[PDB]
Design a protein around this ligand. Structure first.
Ligand SMILES: *C(=O)CCCCCCCCCCCCC
Lengths: 155, 111, 62, 177, 65, 79, 87, 128, 459, 165, 122, 50, 70, 171
């Protein structure tokens, strides 16, 4: 390893950008560094923010699991975009359409559950008639005190 | 009491002993899945018998057979609760797992 | 040597667990708690010998 | 787009790729064989409608609109072969593809139970270590200024010479270990 | 031996699987038909549900008004 | 090891719905280039598959006969 | 289970699938026949034939490799190197 | 007609719908040739360092070491304190702390006030 | 405690008089013998501390830490005897001398009867760790890590010295038994505010508290394996033991004082755990896991409930053993592949099955799998903090996700997947490494049966 | 539920191994007579899944339907419960129609074989279990609660009508 | 299930609320009504270990069926007649509950008719 | 493992259970309540007068 | 037939480590458990008795198991 | 064995098994085979072990502690006797925790033994449990992790002061 093969500060003029592109082994036009917002990205280039699933698996890669060649300058957030993590593959349906469909579906079902909780269903029969003052003694009531007796009659 | 607790505990011990048998192994086993399938079936019988006696009588119990921790005012012990749910769930799971023994013995023979 | 698998795996743990339960587990209090058996009207108890009286005369409906 | 030998996909390659993907998606959407055969014949007739074209720009946005229509009419769950990526059995036995160089780390007690195979492996290792020098000599001269332009490798030229960089392709692990 | 492979034709099937499948299908149909002839209650109807509005007024305790 | 393929003359376009698809294409003016490859699927033991009601009623005849025999036996063994 | 395959069986099956094609004839079909030069077909016929073998052998051949399978012996070669024949 | 694909941050545009892929200009051709030559040179270097019989060890990947040093040790020498970094540090560094402190102080004050007036059900709470 | 100090002072010439090929075997044998004799401290009581003399005593809190320390030292000698095989004989003997001196310093610090002796011994523990870090470290910038560690410790501990001398001049003594019997309440005054800060900030530095934890992700990485183990498994627990001793003296101000500091952990252990979701260096991931566990310890000690104390000491012992095992695993993989990059070495299960089994066991013990000690400690801490307040269960429960979300992740990338092609120097497992990892793991699984000896002083 | 779900998954695995690990149901068909025992097992498992009377599922699933209408319950929950029952019937006969019935779609190398004693004995044991264990458990458990008996005719045939529809 | 239509979509002032029912005194138009009788003594019904939900008016048939289940082991289908008897008693209890529901509905309808008479008379 | 498995009745904790086995046996004989709500004797406490 | 050599990593070292670990564990585990069961069977446990008047036992007499007393 | 008063158990009432069917129950034969195969050899082994025990008998005793004046009869900052008072208070704390454990075991055993009649047949156990946990909360709760006899004395004084203002505000 050596010092001038390592990342440095943010290049400004064309020749420093050309030296950085030579170090990062891309073209001088494909080397687009992060904007100088004082965050610490340095001279690391901005890859087009694509997951490794988007790369063609039928290509013979040096690393088949990551779909990355040897010495290929990887993304700044490569560990976010591995095949076991967040992907960016295209979907058959639009993303906003997906989100509004799912939100409308769950909101409609929750509103239906609310209006069903407000409006219950039952069988048109009376209550369960229990003996012994609606089972006072078996429910844990104190036998020393005599509560108000309910009496269930014939019908 | 004597038959029920002993039979349930030896069902558990019969099911847990092949782990120690394979962890204390030096040579290559001769049909280890066959041995574990026989163990599963024998445990199924040994657990089906107290299920039958519970169906006959209606006997449930709780065994706290190992005083493990006495931490502050709480007491934690190795306790097994044999009630209706465990009684009528354990043999069904053991029979399904016996069928799983046989199907996995056929299926993964190339592995 | 045809029935080793039913003896070296079953009977010896049965003896061990039965001994450990009979003279080391049930000796200590409240380790094993048994539910009291169901008693019906008209049953006979071995421990006391007092037979339960039968229930009331049934007001039959059918 | 991204190819090992060519730097770009031509119009013919794009048309053939669209045709193959359209046939795969149509076979997915048309599960029964006879419906699939009928609509495959219809799709072949539709493709042969615009086969003889003389304007490149007309073919260009005809292919653009055809790809847009194929994107609209795709199967949300296309059929994928088990060995193809995305399949149920993709790269499964790759977990069992142990590389050959680990055989160089075996104990002599467990190397004595396969004598002939390890003798043949020693012969292959000697062949590799005597072919490496002439293969890198062949690759040095054949490479032009600025390195190779394509990823294609030159074959064996002289008699008795092995192709350059052949070990990690010839001795790759089997599909079914 | 085992079942030899065949090219674009029906595979060779022995007697055992055929008689096993036929016996199990016959057992299933016999069981469902016997249980339908014996019980016939949990599927078709168990108890007569009385009509709620047809109850007579004199036994339900509403005065004539 | 080596498996011997059968003759290719037996795979004919007829006996299928593939010839109906082919004549509808000819009515529109096309031709079917893969009749013989798919003709194996409809010829042989796989021809005339049962419907779903036939699948549900598998083993109904012998089951009904055994049911009649068993109910007669239990009807005559009560006396 | 999973019987092995031999290279003679591979070319027998490939010639069997080729010989049922209606845009081909079973007379001048050989194992060293170029599809457009010595046989006279189309590129659409080529990709459709490649798809036919992809359906036949149950695995997907990528387009980059599919453009070069140009003779029946080359198709047999690709199947041979994919499926690890003569073990 | 058709529903046009609207790309988002988590749903990229398909490669075959890209207009830039359908450009046949010469500059795109030389760009593709140059990146192909760069990739071929890197691949040749890798399989030259990879198929060596004498080498038995780790082939050094400069890109991996470059990425690790950019992620780990090169974030502070290229930091400038400006209004954006100050605002993002004030929003994320101390905001959750003061919010959590306020909600927990309110909850504990409510619980202590309920306990000291003897209304909270603490009859069987003897483990603490 | 003069039955253990003199054996170490006799171990010192034992490594200064052996031959150039017999230092390791003799030191390992005699340190294992001392570890065997270390079990005599377990003669404890549920109500009294085992006092030997005016200067040394040991209750049920310092005893597991002592046993862990002089059990860890032979493991240290095993773990650090391969990468120093190329060193000079004098430097090898100096390394063993620093390790023996560090063990003597730790066993003298953990049994200090009076608090000033504990403080001076606690600062005296700096010297061999700093020497090891700045001498036998591998990377270039180890001097920065050593300076950061030394200065964080000293800037924390000098106000602790001022507060301790002020307390001794005020009341009259610094014995822990006397202070247990001569304790006085501290009112809610600003003088007592700064007294609490001076008595706490040293231990919050060495735990480390979130915000002041920046000395850990450096000094745990560039240090060698023995220095990493003594930083991860002992010194944080030294700070915790000091905080446990000190917090008796600072009631009832802490009940309205520890509101920020607790919550400075109660959020921090979230996001630091999230850092383990996005770490390219395995040793930094282990260090941040240690940061999260020590933040849980901080919350448990600072709420000062009994169940919190039991959970704190149990999680201390379990996390020390687990972090030492994980650091040994990282050192072995780094020795095999010559790089600390986690994404480089992949698919190690297909080449190293036993090492994959050890990786699985270490990762399972890291995510608090019951009935291990870590689950017992963390569960007791969660019960105690739920007794403190309700909503804090969320602040623990989400951590229950994220810990798993990195630990099994650390299990996946290093073990599961297609193996790397150009890496072909993966030797089979050394017997030394397997012996060291079994000696790390089997005591934990054996103490899972009988945890009642490591549940604190008030069990 | 355990018996016939294990049966369905286990017969599915038998079919998957018999057809060179081709898991999609769009490359299937013609297995009604090539796999007689497996087709019988799959048909019995699907019937137990649907709620075919006097099978195992009828001794539990249909019964909960009899408790899902005559109770003080939520209306929408019962509504989507019945719609879910209809959907279960729909996808069970969909799997039957695609995998068992129809015409073959697998590649031309036929390797259909199930004559192995382990698989046959295991699926036979699960078949006997799914035939009789539901009856045994439903007639052997002690009566824990009060079953609903007096309830009208249109509510009685609800599960069967939903399944048939 | 037309009672839901008569209660919800119509008017709610004539159909009973099952949460609070009956709202009328039992002694309405019922001279010398009888009380339904227990058969099982509370001690005999207690030591039989019956679940509190099952401890309704028809526990005697439950006790008889449980005894028959105990003695007729292993023939679990030997004495299903007692099970049918218990089910019939439960059916009669449900019939009485439904009769109470219809009586409450008719009394509410009569109260509505009385207030209609008051509105159209006074 | 042999040593830790056989500590001599650790922390007197088991002994405490045995002491409990005596104490309730006392307090279930003389009719005293199970456990007093005051740890010390209230007759030896002088509250601060206010 | 057609037997193919399954390429695998060297399994001698881990098996030797596990074998010698089991051997060195058992070589002391067997005698200590034999001594423990002979103490339990032959020497036996203690018996609870009330303290006689005029006797002050040693501390190790306040414990039950002979190993604990030792 | 255990003392019957400290762990009470109501006497069991096992019904006589009255057969009504002609099918013999296999559980009786299973119990007979178990007693013929398992009970006799285990009983013989236990008898042999009991003989070996009775050959060599030795005694162990239960430790006792006399009474010391407690923390309320100690001078402040006087260590040599207030240490003994704190020691005795900690011993009483441990014994009292064991008493609470005994009551909890009694309650759980009552619930499991009575089964489905636990709402009616275990009123006494739940009442005693409620009483003992109320007294335990009034004695030891909210002491902290650094509890001592001084803290408990202060809590008792605070409780008695609250009781005094309660009877003063009610009179
Ligand atoms: C009035 O309808 C009373 C019956 C119970 C409430 C309605 C239940 C509706 C769903 C079940 C029946 C479905 C019939 C197709």
């Amino acid at each position: 390893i050596t010092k001038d093969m390592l990342p440095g500060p943010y290049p400004k003029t064309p020749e420093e950008r050309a030296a950085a592109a030579k170090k990062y082994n891309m073209r001088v036009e494909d080397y687009e560094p992060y904007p100088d917002d004082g965050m610490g990205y340095g001279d690391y280039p901005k890859l087009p923010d694509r997951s490794q699933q988007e790369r063609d698996p039928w290509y013979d890669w040096d690393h088949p699991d990551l779909r990355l060649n040897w010495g290929e300058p990887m993304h700044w957030d490569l560990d976010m975009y591995i095949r076991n993590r967040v992907d960016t593959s295209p979907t058959p349906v639009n993303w906003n359409l997906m989100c509004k469909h799912l939100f409308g579906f769950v909101a409609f079902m929750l509103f239906m559950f609310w209006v069903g909780e407000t409006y219950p269903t039952y069988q048109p029969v009376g209550p369960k008639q229990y003996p012994y003052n609606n089972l006072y003694l078996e429910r844990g009531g104190d036998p020393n005190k005599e509560p108000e007796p309910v009496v269930h009659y014939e019908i | 009491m004597n038959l029920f607790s002993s039979l349930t505990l030896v069902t558990l011990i019969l099911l847990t002993m092949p782990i120690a048998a394979i962890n204390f192994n030096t040579h290559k086993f001769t049909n280890y899945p066959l041995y574990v399938k026989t163990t599963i079936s024998c445990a199924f019988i040994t657990s089906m018998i107290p299920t039958m006696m519970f169906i006959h009588t209606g006997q449930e119990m709780i065994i706290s057979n190992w005083h493990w921790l006495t931490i502050q005012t709480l007491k934690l012990s190795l306790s097994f609760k044999m009630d209706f749910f465990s009684m009528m769930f354990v043999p069904v799971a053991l029979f399904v797992t016996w069928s799983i023994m046989e199907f996995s013995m056929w299926y993964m023979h190339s592995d | 040597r045809h029935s080793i698998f039913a003896f070296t795996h079953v009977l010896i743990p049965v003896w061990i667990i039965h001994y450990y339960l009979k003279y080391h587990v049930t000796t200590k209090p409240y380790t094993i708690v048994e539910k009291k058996p169901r008693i019906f009207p008209g049953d006979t108890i071995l421990e006391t010998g007092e037979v339960i009286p039968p229930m009331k005369e049934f007001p039959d409906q059918h | 787009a991204f190819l090992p030998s060519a730097a770009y996909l031509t119009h013919q390659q794009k048309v053939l790729q669209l045709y193959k993907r359209a046939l795969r998606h149509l076979e997915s959407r048309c599960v029964h064989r006879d419906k699939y055969r009928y609509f495959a014949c219809l799709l072949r007739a539709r493709f042969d409608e615009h086969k003889n074209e003389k304007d490149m720009v007309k073919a260009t946005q005809l292919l653009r609109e055809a790809e847009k229509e194929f994107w609209h009419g795709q199967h949300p769950q296309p059929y994928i072969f088990p060995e193809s990526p995305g399949g149920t059995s993709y790269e499964r036995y790759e977990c069992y593809k142990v590389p050959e160089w680990c055989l160089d780390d075996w104990h002599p007690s467990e190397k004595a139970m396969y004598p002939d195979y390890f003798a043949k492996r020693e012969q292959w290792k000697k062949l590799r270590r005597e072919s490496w020098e002439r293969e890198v000599k062949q690759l040095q001269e054949e490479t032009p200024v600025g390195g190779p332009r394509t990823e294609a490798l030159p074959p064996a030229r002289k008699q008795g010479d092995l192709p350059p960089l052949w070990w990690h392709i010839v001795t790759r692990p089997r599909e079914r270990p | 031996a085992h079942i030899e492979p065949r090219y674009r034709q029906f595979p060779q099937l022995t007697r055992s699987q055929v008689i096993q499948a036929e016996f199990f299908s016959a057992t299933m149909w016999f069981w469902i038909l016997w249980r339908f002839w014996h019980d016939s209650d949990a599927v078709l109807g168990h108890f007569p549900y009385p009509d709620p509005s047809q109850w007579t007024d004199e036994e339900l305790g509403i005065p004539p008004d | 090891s080596k498996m011997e393929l059968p003759d290719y003359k037996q795979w004919k376009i007829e006996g299928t719905p593939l010839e109906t698809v082919q004549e509808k294409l000819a009515a529109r003016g096309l031709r079917d280039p893969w009749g013989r490859n798919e003709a194996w699927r409809y010829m042989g033991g796989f021809a005339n598959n049962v419907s779903f009601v036939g699948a549900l009623l598998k083993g109904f005849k012998w089951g009904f006969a055994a049911f009649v025999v068993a109910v007669g036996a239990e009807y005559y063994l009560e006396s | 289970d999973a019987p092995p395959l031999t290279l003679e069986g591979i070319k027998d099956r490939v010639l069997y699938v080729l010989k049922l094609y209606d845009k081909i004839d079973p007379e001048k079909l050989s194992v060293n026949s170029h599809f457009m030069k010595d046989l006279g077909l189309d590129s659409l016929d080529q990709v459709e034939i490649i798809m036919a073998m992809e359906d036949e052998f149950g695995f997907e051949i990528p387009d980059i490799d599919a453009e070069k399978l140009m003779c029946p012996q080359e198709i047999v070669d690709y199947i041979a190197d994919k499926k690890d024949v003569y073990e | 007609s058709f529903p046009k694909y609207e790309p988002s941050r988590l749903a990229s545009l398909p490669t075959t719908l890209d207009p830039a892929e359908y450009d046949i200009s010469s500059e795109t051709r030389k760009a593709q040739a140059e990146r192909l030559a760069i990739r071929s040179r890197l691949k040749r270097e890798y399989q030259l360092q990879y198929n060596d019989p004498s080498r038995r060890g780790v082939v050094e990947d400069p890109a991996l070491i470059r990425w690790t040093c950019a992620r780990s040790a090169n974030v502070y020498p290229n930091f400038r304190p400006n209004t954006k970094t100050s605002l993002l540090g004030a929003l994320f560094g101390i905001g959750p702390l003061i919010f959590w402190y306020y909600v927990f102080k309110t909850d504990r004050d409510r619980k202590e006030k309920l306990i000291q007036e003897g209304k909270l059900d603490r009859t069987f709470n003897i483990s603490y | 405690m003069l039955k253990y100090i003199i054996p170490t002072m006799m171990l010192m010439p034992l490594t200064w008089l052996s031959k150039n090929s017999m230092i390791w075997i003799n030191t390992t044998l005699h340190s294992l013998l001392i570890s065997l004799t270390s079990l005599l401290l377990l003669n404890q009581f549920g109500d009294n501390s085992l006092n030997f003399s005016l200067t040394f005593f040991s209750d049920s809190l310092s005893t597991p830490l002592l046993i862990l320390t002089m059990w860890l030292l032979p493991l240290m000698l095993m773990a650090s005897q391969h990468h120093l095989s190329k060193e000079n004989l004098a430097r090898k003997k100096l390394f063993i001398s620093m390790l023996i001196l560090l063990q003597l310093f730790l066993i003298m610090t953990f049994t200090a009867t009076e608090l000033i002796f504990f403080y001076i011994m606690f600062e005296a523990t700096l010297v061999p760790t700093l020497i090891i870090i700045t001498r036998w470290g591998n990377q270039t910038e180890r001097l920065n890590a050593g300076l950061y560690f030394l200065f964080y410790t000293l800037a924390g501990s000098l106000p602790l010295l001022v507060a301790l001398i002020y307390i001794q001049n005020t009341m009259g003594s610094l014995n822990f038994l006397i202070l247990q019997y001569w304790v006085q309440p501290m009112p809610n005054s600003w003088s007592n505010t700064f007294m609490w800060l001076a008595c706490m900030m040293a231990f919050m530095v060495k735990m480390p508290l979130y915000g002041l934890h920046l000395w850990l992700p450096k000094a745990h990485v560039e240090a060698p394996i023995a220095g990493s183990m003594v930083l991860a498994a002992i010194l944080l627990k030294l700070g915790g033991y000091g905080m446990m001793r000190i917090t008796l003296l600072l009631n009832p101000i802490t009940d309205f004082m520890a509101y920020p500091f607790i919550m400075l952990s109660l959020w921090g252990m979230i996001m630091t755990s999230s850092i383990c979701l996005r770490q390219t260096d395995l040793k930094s991931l282990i260090a941040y896991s240690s940061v999260s566990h020590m933040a849980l310890v901080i919350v448990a000690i600072l709420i000062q409930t009994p169940w919190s104390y039991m959970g704190a000491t149990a999680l201390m012992i379990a996390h020390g053993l687990t972090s030492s095992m994980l650091f040994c695993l990282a050192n072995s993989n780094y020795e095999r592949v010559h790089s600390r990059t986690m994404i480089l070495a992949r698919g190690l299960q297909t080449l190293l099955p036993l090492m994959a089994a050890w990786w699985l066991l270490a990762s399972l013990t890291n995510l608090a799998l019951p009935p291990s000690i870590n689950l017992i400690g963390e569960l007791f801490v969660v019960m105690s903090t739920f007794s403190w307040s309700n909503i804090t269960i969320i602040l623990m429960g989400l951590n229950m996700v994220i810990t798993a979300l990195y630990s099994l992740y650390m299990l996946i990338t290093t073990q599961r997947g297609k193996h790397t092609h150009h890496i072909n120097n993966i030797l089979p497992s050394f017997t030394r490494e397997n012996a060291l990892m079994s000696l790390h793991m089997l005591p934990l699984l054996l103490l899972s049966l009988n945890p009642k000896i490591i549940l604190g002083p008030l069990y | 539920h355990a018996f016939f779900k294990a049966m369905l998954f286990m017969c599915s695995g038998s079919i998957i191994h018999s057809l060179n690990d081709e898991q999609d149901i769009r490359k299937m068909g013609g297995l009604f007579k090539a796999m007689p025992f497996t087709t019988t097992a799959l048909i019995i498992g699907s019937l137990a899944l649907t709620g075919m009377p006097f099978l195992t599922g009828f001794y539990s699933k249909d019964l909960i339907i009899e408790s899902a209408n005559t109770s003080y319950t939520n209306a929408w929950a019962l509504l989507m419960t019945l719609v879910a029952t209809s959907f279960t019937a729909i996808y069970s006969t969909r799997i039957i129609f695609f995998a068992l019935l129809g015409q073959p779609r697998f590649p031309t190398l036929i390797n259909i074989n199930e004559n192995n004693p382990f698989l046959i004995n295991s699926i036979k044991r699960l078949l006997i279990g799914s035939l009789f264990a539901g009856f045994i458990i439903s007639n052997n458990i002690p009566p824990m609660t009060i079953p609903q008996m007096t309830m009208p005719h249109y509510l009685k045939m609800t599960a069967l009508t939903v399944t048939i529809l | 299930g037309a009672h839901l239509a008569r209660r919800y979509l119509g008017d709610a002032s004539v159909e009973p609320e099952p949460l609070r029912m009956p709202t009328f005194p039992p002694d309405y138009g019922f001279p010398e009504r009888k009380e339904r009788e227990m058969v099982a003594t509370q001690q005999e019904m207690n030591d039989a270990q019956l679940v509190l939900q099952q401890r309704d008016y028809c526990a005697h048939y439950l006790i008889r069926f449980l005894k028959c289940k105990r003695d007729s082991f292993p023939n679990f289908l030997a004495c299903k007649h007692e099970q049918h008897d218990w089910d019939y008693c439960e059916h009669l209890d449900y019939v009485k509950r439904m009769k109470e529901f219809e009586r409450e509905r008719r009394l509410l309808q009569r109260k509505k008719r009385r207030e209609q008479r008051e509105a159209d008379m006074a | 493992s042999t040593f830790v498995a056989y500590l001599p009745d650790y922390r007197m904790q088991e002994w405490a259970r045995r002491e409990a086995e005596r104490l309730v046996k006392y307090r279930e004989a003389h009719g005293l309540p199970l456990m007093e709500s005051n740890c010390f004797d209230p007759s030896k406490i002088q509250l601060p007068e206010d | 037939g057609k037997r193919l050599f399954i390429i695998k990593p060297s399994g001698f070292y881990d098996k030797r480590f596990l074998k010698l670990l089991r051997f060195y564990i058992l070589l002391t585990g067997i005698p200590v458990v034999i001594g423990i069961t002979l103490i339990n069977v032959f020497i036996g446990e203690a018996e609870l008795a009330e303290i006689p008047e005029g006797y002050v036992p040693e501390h190790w007499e306040y414990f039950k198991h002979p190993i604990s007393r030792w | 064995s255990w003392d019957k008063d400290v762990y009470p158990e109501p006497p069991r009432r096992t019904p006589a098994p009255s057969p009504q069917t002609s099918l013999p129950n296999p559980i009786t034969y299973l119990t007979k085979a178990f007693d013929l195969l398992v009970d006799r050899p285990v009983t013989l082994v236990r008898e042999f072990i009991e003989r070996q025990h009775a050959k060599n008998k030795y005694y162990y005793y239960h430790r006792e502690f006399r009474r010391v004046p407690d923390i309320t009869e100690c001078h402040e900052k006087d260590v040599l006797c207030m240490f003994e008072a704190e020691m005795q208070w900690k011993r009483d704390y441990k014994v009292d925790q064991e008493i609470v454990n005994i009551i909890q075991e009694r309650l759980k055993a009552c619930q499991q033994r009575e089964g489905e009649s636990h709402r009616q047949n275990c009123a006494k156990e739940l009442q005693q449990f409620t009483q003992v946990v109320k007294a335990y909360q009034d004695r030891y709760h909210d002491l902290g992790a650094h509890y001592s006899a001084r803290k408990c004395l202060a809590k008792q004084k605070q409780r008695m002061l609250a009781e005094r203002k309660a009877t003063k505000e009610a009179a």
